[PDB]
Amino acid sequence: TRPTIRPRNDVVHKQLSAFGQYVAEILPKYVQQVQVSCFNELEIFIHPDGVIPVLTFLRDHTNAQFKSLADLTAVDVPTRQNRFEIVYNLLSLRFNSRIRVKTYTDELTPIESSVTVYKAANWYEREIWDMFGVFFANHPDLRRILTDYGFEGHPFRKDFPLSGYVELRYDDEVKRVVAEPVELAQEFRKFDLNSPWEAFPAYRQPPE
Amino acid sequence: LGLREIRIHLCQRSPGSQGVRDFIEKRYVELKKANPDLPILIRECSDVQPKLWARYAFGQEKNVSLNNFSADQVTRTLENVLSGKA
Amino acid sequence: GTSVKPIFSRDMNEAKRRVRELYRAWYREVPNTVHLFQLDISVKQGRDKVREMFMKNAHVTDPRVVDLLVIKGKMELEETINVWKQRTHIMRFFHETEAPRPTDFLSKFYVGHDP
Amino acid sequence: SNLIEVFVDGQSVMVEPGTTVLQACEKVGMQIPRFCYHERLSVAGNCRMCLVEIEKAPKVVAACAMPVMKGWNILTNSEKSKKAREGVMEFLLANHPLDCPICDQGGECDLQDQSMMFGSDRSRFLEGKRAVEDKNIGPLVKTIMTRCIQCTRCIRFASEIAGVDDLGTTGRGNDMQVGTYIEKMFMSELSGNIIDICPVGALTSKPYAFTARPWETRKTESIDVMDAVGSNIVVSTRTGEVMRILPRMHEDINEEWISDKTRFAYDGLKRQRLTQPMIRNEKGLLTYTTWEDALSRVAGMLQSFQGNDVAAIAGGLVDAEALVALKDLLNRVDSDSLCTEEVFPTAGAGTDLRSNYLLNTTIAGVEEADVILLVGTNPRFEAPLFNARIRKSWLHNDLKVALIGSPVDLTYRYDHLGDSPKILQDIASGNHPFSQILKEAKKPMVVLGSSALQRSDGTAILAAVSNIAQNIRLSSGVTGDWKVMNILHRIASQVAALDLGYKPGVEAIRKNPPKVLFLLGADGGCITRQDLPKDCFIIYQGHHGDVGAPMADVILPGAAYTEKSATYVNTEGRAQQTKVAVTPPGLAREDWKIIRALSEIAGMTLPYDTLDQVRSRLEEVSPNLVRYDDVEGANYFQQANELSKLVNQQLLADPLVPPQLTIKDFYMTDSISRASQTMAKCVKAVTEGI
Amino acid sequence: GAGGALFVHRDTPENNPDTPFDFTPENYKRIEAIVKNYPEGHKAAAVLPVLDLAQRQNGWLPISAMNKVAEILQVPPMRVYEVATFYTMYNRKPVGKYHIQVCTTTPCM
Amino acid sequence: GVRTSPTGEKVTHTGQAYDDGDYRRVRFSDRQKEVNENFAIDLIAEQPVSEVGSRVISCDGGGGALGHPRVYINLDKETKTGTCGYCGLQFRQPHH
Amino acid sequence: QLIAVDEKLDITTLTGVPEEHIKTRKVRIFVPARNNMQSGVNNTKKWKMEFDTRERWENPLMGWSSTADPLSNLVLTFSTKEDAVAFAEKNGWSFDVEERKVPKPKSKSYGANFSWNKRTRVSTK
Amino acid sequence: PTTKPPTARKYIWTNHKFNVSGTPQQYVPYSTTRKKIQEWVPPSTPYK
Numbered sequence A: 001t002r003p004t005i006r007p008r009n010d011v012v013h014k015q016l017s018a019f020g021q022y023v024a025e026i027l028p029k030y031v032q033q034v035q036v037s038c039f040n041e042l043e044i045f046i047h048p049d050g051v052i053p054v055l056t057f058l059r060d061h062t063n064a065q066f067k068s069l070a071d072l073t074a075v076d077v078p079t080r081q082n083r084f085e086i087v088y089n090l091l092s093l094r095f096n097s098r099i100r101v102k103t104y105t106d107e108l109t110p111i112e113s114s115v116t117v118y119k120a121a122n123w124y125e126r127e128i129w130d131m132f133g134v135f136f137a138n139h140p141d142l143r144r145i146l147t148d149y150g151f152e153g154h155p156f157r158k159d160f161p162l163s164g165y166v167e168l169r170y171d172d173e174v175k176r177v178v179a180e181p182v183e184l185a186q187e188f189r190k191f192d193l194n195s196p197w198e199a200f201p202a203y204r205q206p207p208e
Numbered sequence B: 001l002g003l004r005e006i007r008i009h010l011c012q013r014s015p016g017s018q019g020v021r022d023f024i025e026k027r028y029v030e031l032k033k034a035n036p037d038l039p040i041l042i043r044e045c046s047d048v049q050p051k052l053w054a055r056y057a058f059g060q061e062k063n064v065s066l067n068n069f070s071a072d073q074v075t076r077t078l079e080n081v082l083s084g085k086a
Numbered sequence C: 001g002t003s004v005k006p007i008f009s010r011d012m013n014e015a016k017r018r019v020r021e022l023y024r025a026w027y028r029e030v031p032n033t034v035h036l037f038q039l040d041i042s043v044k045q046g047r048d049k050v051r052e053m054f055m056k057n058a059h060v061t062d063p064r065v066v067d068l069l070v071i072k073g074k075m076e077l078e079e080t081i082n083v084w085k086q087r088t089h090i091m092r093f094f095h096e097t098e099a100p101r102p103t104d105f106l107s108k109f110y111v112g113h114d115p
Numbered sequence D: 001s002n003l004i005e006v007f008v009d010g011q012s013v014m015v016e017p018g019t020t021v022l023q024a025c026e027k028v029g030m031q032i033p034r035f036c037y038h039e040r041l042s043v044a045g046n047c048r049m050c051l052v053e054i055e056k057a058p059k060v061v062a063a064c065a066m067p068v069m070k071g072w073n074i075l076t077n078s079e080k081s082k083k084a085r086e087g088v089m090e091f092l093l094a095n096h097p098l099d100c101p102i103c104d105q106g107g108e109c110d111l112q113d114q115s116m117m118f119g120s121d122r123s124r125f126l127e128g129k130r131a132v133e134d135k136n137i138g139p140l141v142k143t144i145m146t147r148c149i150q151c152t153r154c155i156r157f158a159s160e161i162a163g164v165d166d167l168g169t170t171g172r173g174n175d176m177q178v179g180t181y182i183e184k185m186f187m188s189e190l191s192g193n194i195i196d197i198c199p200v201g202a203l204t205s206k207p208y209a210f211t212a213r214p215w216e217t218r219k220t221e222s223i224d225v226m227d228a229v230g231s232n233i234v235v236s237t238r239t240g241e242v243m244r245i246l247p248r249m250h251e252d253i254n255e256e257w258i259s260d261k262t263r264f265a266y267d268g269l270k271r272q273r274l275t276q277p278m279i280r281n282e283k284g285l286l287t288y289t290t291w292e293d294a295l296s297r298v299a300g301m302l303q304s305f306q307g308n309d310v311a312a313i314a315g316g317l318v319d320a321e322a323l324v325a326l327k328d329l330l331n332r333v334d335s336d337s338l339c340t341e342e343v344f345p346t347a348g349a350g351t352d353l354r355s356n357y358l359l360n361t362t363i364a365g366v367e368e369a370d371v372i373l374l375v376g377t378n379p380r381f382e383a384p385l386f387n388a389r390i391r392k393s394w395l396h397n398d399l400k401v402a403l404i405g406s407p408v409d410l411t412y413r414y415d416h417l418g419d420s421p422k423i424l425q426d427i428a429s430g431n432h433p434f435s436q437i438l439k440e441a442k443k444p445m446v447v448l449g450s451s452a453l454q455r456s457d458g459t460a461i462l463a464a465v466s467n468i469a470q471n472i473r474l475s476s477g478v479t480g481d482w483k484v485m486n487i488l489h490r491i492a493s494q495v496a497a498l499d500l501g502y503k504p505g506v507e508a509i510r511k512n513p514p515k516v517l518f519l520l521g522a523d524g525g526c527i528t529r530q531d532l533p534k535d536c537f538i539i540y541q542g543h544h545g546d547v548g549a550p551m552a553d554v555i556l557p558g559a560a561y562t563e564k565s566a567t568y569v570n571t572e573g574r575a576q577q578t579k580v581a582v583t584p585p586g587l588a589r590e591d592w593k594i595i596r597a598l599s600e601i602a603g604m605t606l607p608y609d610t611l612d613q614v615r616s617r618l619e620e621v622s623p624n625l626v627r628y629d630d631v632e633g634a635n636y637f638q639q640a641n642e643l644s645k646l647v648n649q650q651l652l653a654d655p656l657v658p659p660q661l662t663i664k665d666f667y668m669t670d671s672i673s674r675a676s677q678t679m680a681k682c683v684k685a686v687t688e689g690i
Numbered sequence E: 001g002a003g004g005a006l007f008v009h010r011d012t013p014e015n016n017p018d019t020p021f022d023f024t025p026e027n028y029k030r031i032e033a034i035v036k037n038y039p040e041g042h043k044a045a046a047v048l049p050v051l052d053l054a055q056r057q058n059g060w061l062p063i064s065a066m067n068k069v070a071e072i073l074q075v076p077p078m079r080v081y082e083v084a085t086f087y088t089m090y091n092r093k094p095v096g097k098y099h100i101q102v103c104t105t106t107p108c109m
Numbered sequence F: 001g002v003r004t005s006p007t008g009e010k011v012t013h014t015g016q017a018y019d020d021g022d023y024r025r026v027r028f029s030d031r032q033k034e035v036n037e038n039f040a041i042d043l044i045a046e047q048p049v050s051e052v053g054s055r056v057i058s059c060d061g062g063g064g065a066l067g068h069p070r071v072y073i074n075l076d077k078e079t080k081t082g083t084c085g086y087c088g089l090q091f092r093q094p095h096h
Numbered sequence G: 001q002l003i004a005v006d007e008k009l010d011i012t013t014l015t016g017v018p019e020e021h022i023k024t025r026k027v028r029i030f031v032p033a034r035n036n037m038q039s040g041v042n043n044t045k046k047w048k049m050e051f052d053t054r055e056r057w058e059n060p061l062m063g064w065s066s067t068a069d070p071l072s073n074l075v076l077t078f079s080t081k082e083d084a085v086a087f088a089e090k091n092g093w094s095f096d097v098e099e100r101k102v103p104k105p106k107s108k109s110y111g112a113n114f115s116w117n118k119r120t121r122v123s124t125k
Numbered sequence H: 001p002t003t004k005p006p007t008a009r010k011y012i013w014t015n016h017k018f019n020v021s022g023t024p025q026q027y028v029p030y031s032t033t034r035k036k037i038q039e040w041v042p043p044s045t046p047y048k
């Protein structure tokens, strides 16, 4: 089991479980779940109303001191009633640790902006709004960041087609760049790669 | 005026078609004896409503509801459709 | 109460008032847009385009959707005023190059298979 | 209850006695590896891939053949089970050929997948591999026997499902080979299914060879229209071209199988295709034309005549939407001469009551009957999956089968009563020995083929069969909702046309010949220009150039069943809908769209513009045409039987001979299969085996 | 070493379905007695002796002999082919008048 | 093994050639059509059949690890040679 | 505080999809059928939502397969049928739903291969 | 290649060619596959 298998670290697992219990105890009002993965990553699932408190705690508590916001992003899962999942990755330099905070929202429910807690969030939230259409309340300047001016739709959503809806070309009659409905000389070839046999028995779901 | 075909759309188990069902199982045959050349299409309705269709020359057709009718009511409306009486 | 929280407006009246504010701002901005971008259209043409764009979403009855539409329209106006957009972006609202697609049954049948 | 408690990995499951370890494991979502076990075949137990560990038992057991005991704990993922799987896969791969890049089973191999999920990743086999010569079993199934793993699935399928005992094993030990031991063709109307059951590339499809890979294909779930069975199928396309047809599992219609005509006649959709509208020029020859001018010509000719002067004949592959559109279009002209080439008697009830022309017992109900009487039909070629269901009930339920007609080979032994129709009357009379047999039966079934109704005395035959069914119902009483009387259709478009009110048969047109004739895919040759007045305007609308197209004045190219979302009704009355896999070639258009455009040009615009609206019209005419999996219906046998007694037409002293008498007649029945080059090869191979 | 012989049949002037083979009337009496040994409704159980009987009359087993046995016992010919190719006492190729078999297994080795 | 179309166009080894009425030939005006001159079917047909003294032969295409995956060919049929499924080389046993 | 919207959910005006690809599109909600070439059933667990097939033609250059509809390759995965229906309704697409087809429980018996009097006795193994 | 010559093959070009872009010898792409669907051919004889 030695050469080709990634080794385990039970000490970090125990420490992360203890700190997850600690955070859940201190903030019962917003914490809904705590997990530690098999590769020692701590995850905290919270109610959407606790974004500002929990993060503030994790930034300012003497035992947390998660001063750095490494990354903030969203995940689109259409089968869920709350379509969008907001993920915050935080780094603590004092204790040399990383934590993850996850909440949820849908297309119409705004999420409170965390610019006051972390300045770094300012662009990330913008990007989320650009790519998924999640509105952030009380954002100092919330606008598109990555897409073209006047772009309609949110590309990172699962129902958004890969090639989009419009394409650009220069037209000499009007002497300018114009947008037209997308047309492809070669259509993208969809591949069915999934095997009809189960791969991981440990992740099997109840058959209802 | 010129009738071409008639359709009875009756729902199989709903109570509102019960009388219509009775018609089909009591006095449809006699009617088919009386009109041996008139298409009388018996078709099965959904859970919604029973009704009767009547088609005339040049594709004009009209429908009448048969909900909660009786055997007497359905033969009365059928004979009204058959004759030049509404 | 359906457990839904607002963005800005709590009923249709506040959403309508925000719509009217945005419409006023766009109507005021149109002549400045025509002058700055050096567009070959009249002020009346641009204002009719604004009216059409506003009426395209006239069927909405959800205050949250109206709120998000007003927010997107505000971003569009802020893009236009600051000259972040270019003449190409502004003129994409008119589809001058696109050939009009016929709407009656016979033309669709003659050209192809699309309904 | 009778259920016993077992444990799968410590989880409690309640199962009926006789359940095997494999079924108990799959009751909790665990699929045991398998190669030789198929749930529709007899248990083999030879591949040994399914070996699983039972707690407190030193020996692993074959899950596919081992009934679960009370209190057993099945350990599907213990070290013993994993080691058994690895060893069995090692043995399987020891002599397997390094053929994956040139094998058509490439991305679809159970051997490959179960090696990746349950086997090892290396090889310690340091010897030379074995090689086996190939066997030729016909043009449909390509054989490369080096890839065979000797699971004997094909042998069991042939012996049980197909009723053909030509496949077997010769030799023993390592040099044991699956074949026929002689140069013999494996001809069966269900012979192609052995390609699907074979887990490896030992048996593959010859027409499909080397053309596509499974990951490239886009799968469209559709309905087969080559018979009235309505088998659920998958059309696999790639870059807008049909690659192959596969079975789609429907437990009540086709189970897991399709017919050879269903599987291998798709290439006929690329051979003689109508792509552009055509008209006659000054020289009397067909020449290409725009849609506008052809539609204007047809509309101008339609505006002139009216009433009885306009008639239409529907073909065998016509959808319900096109049928209703044509019905409406001809009704606006005040015409009622809407006919089908297939003949169904109109005396008494005729098409007035649905159960008069349906398979009322349904296909799944065959597995409940204790006796079945077949009259004037060859179910093997008319409805191969219906015959497969009959064979399955004959094998498992000990079903008793009798036939009146030509003594054809049905792949199962039956009691042959003869081919004289008078025998039917004798059975009704009670003089015949078989009549008693029907009386003792709890669930008798009588099936009358629509092919016997094509002859002159079809009404008399139907009356006699109804008399037999009524005698059974009167003697034995009403068992319940059993529906003794049945009609077996062979045309995919017939039942929908009868539901919509089309007149069965052509006799209405022969009685009053028309001036304008619509041939909606009518390629049967029932009506020619000798039976019509001269200067008759014939309009053909279809997808193939066949016997009906050259005799037309205007040709309108239509879509095939793979190119539209269309509704077809089963022989048991079940409505189903196809899906678009590819668009029609060239200028070809959807049929109902063609009829609606023609109506708009001619001035009598139809009230529907989209598919949803035309299906709403379908519901208005016959509500059962929008219930897309329902098969339940009413029993109006009493009224039809009473109305069939008022006509006393005499029977004919002519023996019943089905149109399909041997396998050679099976391959080409409609325009698509006649245009298919694979069916030409099948006919040539059957006529001369060489 | 290896098997050497082949388990497929190819037609040949000396071995084909039209090759003349039939049972002698006394061999038919023997076949009747053999068939009488097994329960009614199980006649395939007689393929092993009857086939062997053919090999005793003819000296080997042509394809016509297998076909005749299958026709007599009303079994599919493929089953008779399987029996003939499975068992090594059956000669699917002509042999000499005196067929010499030498045991070479470990006790005799 | 190139042949000439009735219109004068070279025919590729796949057999493709535009018809007389096909406008797509205009792309070759003032330019050329690219046709590979070495036909693999004709080239592989020239190879002599290898006589071997065994029922089963092995083929890897030559070059060891520089060829194709090693496969084993049965040579029990006397009316037809054994063909490699990768390389096309033919093998047979001594007959006659 | 909450505002109690009692309307039907409709995000059509926010997705930026052209109105052609909202009103004239028909989606299919279904559990995909098992590939008949393999016995594995792992690809028949989830629900799929797909769009109606549109026209594909041949490229005048190189003969490739050209399309004109952006939803040709859009396939969505859902855990239950109700989730797929809710997604389709809130996106404004008209849908057709096919019920799940599950194989019936079979009655297998190895000993049946050797019946004394029944028809299920096999002739070879 | 004077001291270590390459292997000789019958299909190897005996005459090297430079980049021929912009000359009449330039490569022009085309579809190498045959026609997919064959159309019905009407009879040459009149029907009436």
Ligand code: SF4
Residues within 6 Å of the ligand: D096, D097, D098, D099, D100, D101, D103, D104, D105, D106, D107, D109, D110, D111, D112, D147, D199, D200, D201, D202
């Ligand atoms: S059958 Fe499967 S494992 Fe065998 S060569 Fe073909 S793809 Fe490979």
Ligand code: SF4
Residues within 6 Å of the ligand: D147, D148, D149, D150, D151, D152, D153, D154, D155, D178, D197, D198, D199, D200, D202, D203
């Ligand atoms: S040919 Fe295929 S199905 Fe038949 S025994 Fe061999 S591997 Fe099994």
Ligand code: FES
Residues within 6 Å of the ligand: D033, D034, D035, D036, D037, D044, D045, D046, D047, D048, D049, D050, D051, D062, D063, D064, D065
């Ligand atoms: S699946 Fe059980 S032994 Fe083959």
Ligand SMILES: [Mg+2]
Residues within 6 Å of the ligand: D105, D194, D195, D196, D197, D198, D199, D200, D201, D202, D203, D204
């Ligand atoms: Mg296979």
Ligand SMILES: [Zn+2]
Residues within 6 Å of the ligand: F059, F060, F061, F068, F084, F085, F086, F087, F088, F089
């Ligand atoms: Zn080779």
